[model samples]
Target: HHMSEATLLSYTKKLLASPPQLSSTDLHDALLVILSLLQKCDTNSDESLSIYTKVSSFLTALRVTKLDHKAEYIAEAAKAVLRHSDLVDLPLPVILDIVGTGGDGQNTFNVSTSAAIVASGIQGLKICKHGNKDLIGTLGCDMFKVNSSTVPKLWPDNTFMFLLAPFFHHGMGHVSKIRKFLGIPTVFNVLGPLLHPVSHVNKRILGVYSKELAPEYAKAAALVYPGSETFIVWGHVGLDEVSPIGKTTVWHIDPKTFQLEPSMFGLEEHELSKCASYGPKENARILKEEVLSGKYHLGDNNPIYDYILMNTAVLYCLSQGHQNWKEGIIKAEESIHSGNALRSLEHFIDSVSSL
Candidate 1:
């Protein structure tokens, strides 16, 4: 049996007004029915779009309602993810994730993915990356030459798993169609960052584009991953990274508010344009030919290199301890300078290519 159209729309209305206070049951219950509706109906049709619009608004409302409500909505998302994926029996390893929600439209380089490769060589930090089809962000797949759609697990210390979303996140496939029809950034931007497809992740350095989203993501992260240390950041240049060009604001749950800049990590500031990317191919070129290739002078106005280094440095600090971005910078630079970063790219490429 299914709920009537009018009834579900009214329920969506009620949810938009005020989402559930505690558990995810109500949202979970309705989403099951709504998802079925979208499955059989034309996603581009008025009915599907209208229902999805309402559902998207309702999801956004939870974030706006209160932190508890937002956390509940995120819990629903986590449950949805679990439903769509089979559990992999692996040790609860210390996993590190680096990602950013790319809605600010700055089109900056893939700093998160680049740093992730750099981060993998830092020893003891196993980078478990969750990426979608965004070409720029997914360039690290090219970094590893990791072919599409093989569900790989986390490897040894400083090794990595470039977890592709569609391979593991089957439930969101319907929502992706709905979102394509919406043709806009929806709650999925916030929801996407938290859906890492791994339950064992313990340390994170994540990025968002909006001031409003940073804290909400941090709050949701604290509940979803609880006891894990996470840094949610947005840059001064209207980018989704720890901006090497200027200051960035960071949040860690409902706790301390932090500020960051290139200077804090002992780097020189530059124009944001200096960190801009060409398309995916050119970016892949820069990743190998320049940034990951050692022997570059960081203080000599190489902003893209600095961008990846700055982010990798911060990830280093986050993974090793909740301390020392300066030494984080030093270590990240050496990781590249020592050519271990390039070997990581080589190792991942050979390892994945062999598969």
Candidate 2:
């Protein structure tokens, strides 16, 4: 007999009620059962309630073990639900995603968004930024506000395109409420970087809240995209991205797994307080006024500016075929100082507005 939704729901309920210590095979089977049921349910319908319960339980199991195998399972489940899109056709090497798992609770400014905008100014780079409002709810192009079916055709002419997660993954709406209701970190939180709809994204910089999860996520990225290069990073102080205030650990998956440091970019450590913002609006304003303005130098003693430069330069180096972070920093500085980064932002705004 085929495994029915009812059977999976029953299994999930029993599994969660008396959470079992699962082996790798057991965990994968359980997740497959849940994902299969999710594929059959309508978003937020009664059937989806069962789907939500099972997923939540799976998340709880993930939380308990804190194992790399569990993280990989959840990532695979999430990837199974991602709706494929034909809109993005950029080469994997030139395409980039600067994203985070976002449960860091630091509430700093949108460092990744700012860096992505600046990096977009690099002539050959294309950024497909995936984000949600959960952490620092802010505005970018509301891909959901427009027609979902039209998104591919509406792909912006400029290098920067913000992909609101909900628009790309219709199946996610069923569990969106479940995620919010939990009000805590789960495996779902860590799956963001691995679930982009454009399946061919070859280069990514993914940030997680905890240092331990960095290698796990790097492994998952490698499994999902064999030839892709993924850099899994976490700040020693808990910021999701590389922090200017503290050491940030990096795990790179390319030819082989290895580690690196933020200091490689020649940036001095500062206080995380220097990069803090009251909220998203303030952060957006700063991105416009300070970092992208082409006015601040590396030694300007502005932490936010330096933070953006550091992150942008990393992407520049990765995308531009530079051998080291140092070369990327020089190119990133030229993009900003020459006003090209600001122009890139303006061009993006105009293009999206026209869309």
Candidate 3:
């Protein structure tokens, strides 16, 4: 009878396919097991009897998972996102994701989406914000209307896409509730969940809310998706999106970090409020008129316009592997003025309209 603990350990190791420690795959299966358990229960009743019985094991699994399998759990969660995403035989050779960690801050409001949209029109890069998930989720600002039914069709048709979470990263009902309960936010709350589920994306521009987390995220990215071209950015003025208001610092998994002043991209710094904050009331028109239109003085001192281009340069440089920042800036300008940016956005809208 005293051997039961060893037996339990042996069974546990075999069940999770571990070397006595959890693998990323083990984490994945644990989440899958919890989700499978969810499917078998009565979601409507607060008084369901048997459902509570299994809660202990689920908590035990998660507590063990939470111990330090940061990479393992995140990898499995991202894999869950991909597992549910139905895209296959993808048309593009390269993919990009630009997303920021949480902030209620306004000036950086649309920089990520803007940067992504602009980059898509440049030299044929595809950008998806499965960051689109959070922006709409908590902010109540809907950028795109994408359902699970529409994803396979939209993934191929649009140069820039916004993928929401619940659909792609399902099995979160249990955890999502707790996140709100402890709503102040945690590092675990920010970075790992901010990751795009698309595993094949080789290039990424990740914006974290603070300068300190930038290098950390780069290291995490390198570990999670090795050899990916990743730029971890922090807008020093305290917003997540690449700053248009002031200096923004960027890091690689490399030993050194870099900074971008407004002038580096030929932009003049402006206060955060100087950038537009039209809210959900007119983001699409802004997206249509100010952003994709390219009608404005492409890189002039217009803060909103400058904000977008600076981020665009980040994406532009990373996508093409240009060592020189000048190329990124010039390409962003060319992308806008040539009307290619508008065309790409319009094409995406048109593609969505067809279905």
Candidate 4:
């Protein structure tokens, strides 16, 4: 027989009421039950509404009680519900994702999103970013405007595609409400970067809010996709993307780990304050009109432009099988100064809009 709402609440209470002594098998079973109940519950009903708190509480307990293994299990359980796709059957190695585990609380603009467009303008690089609103989430983003036809006939030939998390992972609808109510960083936040709906992504550059979770996320990426390349990053001052201000920690599954500094790219470090934006709208405008269009006169001195250049350069260099950051920066500048990046972003916005 199926478990009822009352039983699920009882289970949630019991789980939170005690210390985490449950075996992995038990934990897995509990996750299955809770997720199943969440999926079945009527989101509009009062009892069902209370289930959000119950689920959030249970997850919070899981995080506080035994942080590591419990988080792994939670992510594992969440993965079971993920829906997969190839994002228009784009070829491997050319497709890449630049994403982050939000809740950095720094309120920085969407550097990775803009950088994805810049990187896509580099010859032979195709970027497939997955994000949501609050500037980043699994729902409520315009990326959903992209459909199958949006992918041009010149597939994988330096293009950008965005995968809105909700459209790809339908099962997330069951828990997104609970996540919203929680209003804090949870294990679920980390899982978003690792669980891209595109199953064939060749490489990923992921940013995390917490430095402590950087290596853990790297290991998780290795465990999840043994063959693909992954870079887990955390900025020194708590930004998710590679910071133009100071050192940034990067965890790679293959080379293990490394530190990135502004000097490596022939640029001086700048404060995060210089890159700050009023909101995503301004960020989007800067990306389209300044960064991507190569219209800004600040050059590398502009933190936002330099930030996008740093990220886009890394992706461009990697796609070309190069490890030199300096080379990447040169190519990125070329793409921007020549107006190639601007054209690429405009083309992408236009194509997706028509669809």
- Per-residue CA lDDT of model 3 for 36-137, tens digit only, reads 544555564653234433433344444453432354455554554344343324433668887776653544456776777778888778877655334322
Badly placed stretches (over 4 Å) of model 2 are: 1-6, 13-58, 65-71, 83-93, 134-142, 145-151, 154-156, 255-263, 321-323
Task: After the best TM-score superposition of candidate 4, give how far the Cα of residue 90 lies from its true spot, in angstroms.
Answer: 6.6
| Residue 352 shift from truth in candidate 1, angstroms | 1.7
After superposition, candidate 1 runs with Cα above 4 Å error: 3-7, 16-24, 42-69, 92-94, 134-154, 183-185, 253-255
Clashes of 1: 0
Superposition error at 346 for model 4 (Å): 2.9
| Candidate 3, run of 10 with poorest lDDT | 2-11
Candidates in order, TM-scores: namely 0.84, 0.80, 0.73, 0.83
- Report the lDDT tens digits of candidate 4 across residue range 29-107: 5555666768756657876767666677667776676553344564565455553222354444467889887768886
Error of 1 at 211 (Å): 2.0
| Candidate 3: pairs in clash | none
Q: RMSD in angstroms, all models?
A: 3.8, 4.3, 6.1, 4.0
Tens digit per residue, CA lDDT, model 2, 1-355:
3445565545445444545445444555555565556566666788777667766766676566564335466555555455332234433247888888887888676788788877887888878777765221343543444334444554546676666676665655645666798786765676666667665466888888887666667777787667667777788888788788757777777653334455777877768777786676778767777677765887776788888888888787667544488878787888788888778767655555666
Q: How much lDDT does each candidate structure score? A: 0.69, 0.67, 0.61, 0.68
Better of 3 and 4 by lDDT: 4
> How do the residues 68-144 of candidate 1 rate in per-residue lDDT, one tens digit apiece?
23556666655655565544444544578888878788867877778988887776677877766544333444323
User: Lowest summed lDDT over 10 consecutive residues: which window, candidate 2?
Assistant: 83-92
Query: Judged by lDDT against the true structure, how good is candidate 2?
Result: 0.67
Clashes of 3: 0
